[PDB]
């Protein structure tokens, strides 16, 4: 159907765009658009990317009146996928930015990794509960989500601490790693995502 990628948030999103583009190749009738405002009608797959601090992430979302647009997609039973910082924005709050409310699309909060050597950077394994490919992905983050098991899609360890590298609540997905920077298994992940939104 129609895939949308929010393009306002911190960090360059062209990489995730290329990744999603090449991944939607093997299928068809797949439209990809960059989203800057609500001045677009619902997509079937909406990506919320980003690389930066929780606070700026939400600011670029509200400054462009995109918050309701995102909440609108969930209520309307559509697939919303948070990538990297976008995954964190899915929760209620974060230590990285006190007082700033998150999209609150998933019950839980965000806290800094316990490790002394931050930020967490490099490849690490992600073990999925189901659906997606176990394997190594590329992470670059300082914060992690803290949610209930019910919403844990995948896990990853860094310096003794295991955290949810992937989360799920209905048609809402979140990946703490960069799919577009995870080569083979990444494109495969993105494909599986498109694949899931194609059915239902």
Domain count, the chain: 1
Is 196 assigned a catalytic role?
no
Q: How far apart are CA 110 and CA 91, in angstroms?
A: 7
Is 84 assigned a catalytic role?
yes
DSSP 99-154: T------EEEEEEE-S-SS-SEEEEEEEEESSSSPPEEEEEEESEEEEE-GGGEEE
Is 191 assigned a catalytic role?
no
Q: Which of 56, 93, 96, 180 is catalytic?
A: 180
Q: How far apart are CA 156 and CA 10, in angstroms?
A: 24
- Alpha-carbon torsion angle 97, 102, 107, 112, nearest 10: -30
Q: In a 3-state reduction of DSSP, which class is residue 48?
A: strand
Among left, alpha and beta (phi > 0; psi -120 to 50; other), residue 58 is: alpha
CATH value at residue 82 = 3.40.50.880
Instruction: Mention every residue, 6+ apart, whose C-beta is less than 8 A from residue 148.
Output: 107, 108
Q: Where are the beta strands (DSSP E) in the chain?
A: 2-6, 31-35, 45-48, 79-83, 91-94, 106-112, 120-128, 135-141, 143-147, 152-158, 161-169, 172-175
Resolution in A: 2.4
Q: Are 44 and 29 in contact (CB under 8 A)?
A: no
Q: How far apart are CA 85 and CA 176, in angstroms?
A: 7
Q: Which of 84, 120, 151, 191 is catalytic?
A: 84
Q: Which of 53, 73, 120, 178 is catalytic?
A: 178
Method: X-ray
The domain containing residue 185 runs over which residues? 1-200
């Amino acid at each position: 159907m129609r895939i949308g990628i929010i393009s306002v948030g911190p960090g360059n999103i062209m990489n995730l765009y290329r990744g999603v583009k090449r991944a939607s190749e093997n299928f068809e009738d797949v439209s990809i658009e960059l989203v800057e405002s609500p001045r677009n009608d619902l997509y079937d797959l909406l990506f919320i990317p980003g690389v930066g601090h929780f606070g700026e992430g939400m600011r670029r979302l509200r400054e462009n009146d995109l918050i309701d647009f995102v909440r609108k997609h969930v209520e309307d039973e559509r697939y919303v996928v948070g990538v990297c910082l976008g995954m964190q924005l899915l929760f209620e709050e974060s230590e990285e930015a006190p007082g700033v409310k998150g999209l609150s699309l998933i019950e839980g909060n965000v806290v800094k990794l316990r490790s002394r050597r931050l930020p967490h950077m490099g490849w690490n394994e992600v073990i999925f509960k189901d659906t997606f490919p176990n394997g190594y992905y590329y992470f670059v983050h300082t914060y992690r989500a803290v949610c209930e098991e019910e919403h844990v899609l995948g896990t990853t360890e860094y310096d003794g601490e295991i955290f949810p590298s992937a989360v799920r609540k209905g048609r809402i997905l979140g990946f703490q790693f960069h799919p577009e920077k995870s080569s083979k298994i990444g494109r495969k992940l993105l494909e599986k995502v498109i694949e899931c939104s194609l059915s239902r």
